[model samples]
Target: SFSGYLKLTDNVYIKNADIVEEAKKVKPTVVVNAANVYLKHGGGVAGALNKATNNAMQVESDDYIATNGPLKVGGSCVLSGHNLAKHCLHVVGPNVNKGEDIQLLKSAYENFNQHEVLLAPLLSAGIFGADPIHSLRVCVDTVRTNVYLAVFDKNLYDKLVSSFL
Candidate 1:
């Protein structure tokens, strides 16, 4: 992706790239799981990652939840990525049906600390049924880490261009 970044916040972005390809290419230190509250690799980014990592993440996800408990919406946990990356940071974004609001989404992002290269997805906008624009807005505003938003589809990418750029 030429002219890789559209915003001048400092870090270069790999705009509109398939998250899986970007993960393989960038080899980020951590990959954020736009996860379900159960922390399983259920669908979308989570499912894709599980497939990419040969479902190794699934065992770890089960382990993490088995010991700790449900990863509440806006809460987070870390697990071994095996080959995908050093760490997979799983943060559950709102499903909205639970009356979970954007503040929780904001809180989900608050768990991050800026150290490693992180590849993240547009949380809640997938199967979670969120307004993509607001989800992305929360991301750009709250995310201060070395993070890349791995947009998977045309709509999210276009929304990023039209709304953020």
Candidate 2:
């Protein structure tokens, strides 16, 4: 079944693919983009979405007014009026290699409230260069509403298989 490849939770689901491509089919109400305190698209999921959408992401991001360091490690900022999706939840995370990794990853997913559908990648897996398996675990446990985790890397897919299945 088209939906079988995805493992469904009460409200959350996990699928394997590049989130940029996943977004095309999922049409998620909201998509999570890991961002820095600057709220700009540099790399990782943010860069991918920006490239895919003709830089509309940066325009949407510019509207963000961060009061506290633009968002502490693990803090989040929401971007609206973007063509990417109905909304984009941008979160800041720790430099995983620098330690305090788990706590930082948890912070990224904690404030996602009231959204009906969401698409998130394995936080910190790219620009922050963290562990996808561990980061993915935190996202799945933290997001309570209807959420979809985009799994693109082979390592992550294997991890999801051995860990969840």
Candidate 3:
């Protein structure tokens, strides 16, 4: 797990691996979950994370949304990590908006800055339809430090290596 890696900056590193397995190994203070505004852990990273964490995180999220309401595109919610991480930061991913997602992604990156160690995937690059390469580019540029990106896609991994390394 995370045996192979590349450095994007002094504190930002890209690892070619599954985000869940990587989080399990590193056990960071916080792991960013690309979630929908409704906070449904149905598929993709959000789903796998909840499943692995034994759904305690989801339960906390349910309790949060019970009164707090759904998250907006740029909004975020934090919950107890239970096992893998110390805290789970859930941020709403953009649906099909304009370059606003760029700012949203930037905001998503910002949410984790308070934590000592932040583990994230290419936010919204999957079902949310954000461009994988470009999303990593935003992350490569925005995150100040101590961010581990689990680049699961090969083209994204190669592009990051050639572009940043």
Candidate 4:
């Protein structure tokens, strides 16, 4: 039952479930990643999605962002030729404890191209260590498309439910 816990807007939904599994199920128009500036899928949700898609995500991201010289926080790049979805959007997450969570998320969403359905992780909750609540809030407030926030961590799921729902 990978169902949403909150529907932030008519176009945005938040769900507590295995993000990777949820992405596979949704097969969204865009698979969004809380990515690194370097465009490397080193760990967390990015790593899992990279592995799931057989490294094509990382390759496409690297090629796309390389010209941009390591994406800045809040910046994003879109990649195509992916079988899992029509496109993948890589958004740079805020660095740990930088206090730029909301700004970065807003920027990321602002920069993202709109789609009918988009699936994304709880942005920056893992390796980036940004406050998940703030990031999620910003995402819900800012994203312009039909977005889905997927949470795989049990503790994070509970926190999101209590704080947002």
TM-score of each: 0.87, 0.82, 0.86, 0.84
* Top candidate when judged by lDDT against the true structure: 3
Which predicted model would earn the best TM-score? 1
**Model 3 quality (TM-score):** 0.86
In order of lDDT, best first, we have: 3, 1, 4, 2
The window of 10 residues in a row where model 3 has the poorest summed lDDT is 93-102
Q: Extract clashing residue pairs from model 2.
A: 17-151
Clashing pairs in 1: none
Q: lDDT of candidate 4 vs native? A: 0.73
lDDT of candidate 3 over 1-165, digit per residue (tens): 335667777777778778888788878788889888878888888888999988877888888889888988867888877677888888775754434455577777666666666888878787777877677777767677677888777777887678663
TM for candidate 2 is: 0.82
Per the 3 Å backbone cut-off, how many clashing residue pairs does candidate 3 have? 0
Ranked by TM-score from best down, the candidates are 1, 3, 4, 2
Off by over 4 Å in 3: 1-3, 97-102
Stronger candidate by lDDT (3 vs 4): 3
Candidate 1 lDDT tens digits, 7-78: 526552436777767777666678788888787786788888888888888988888778888977888888
Q: Candidate 4 at residue 112, lDDT?
A: 50
lDDT of 4 by residue, 72-156 (tens): 8888777762655667788787767556655566777775545656777767677777788887777777777677778888888
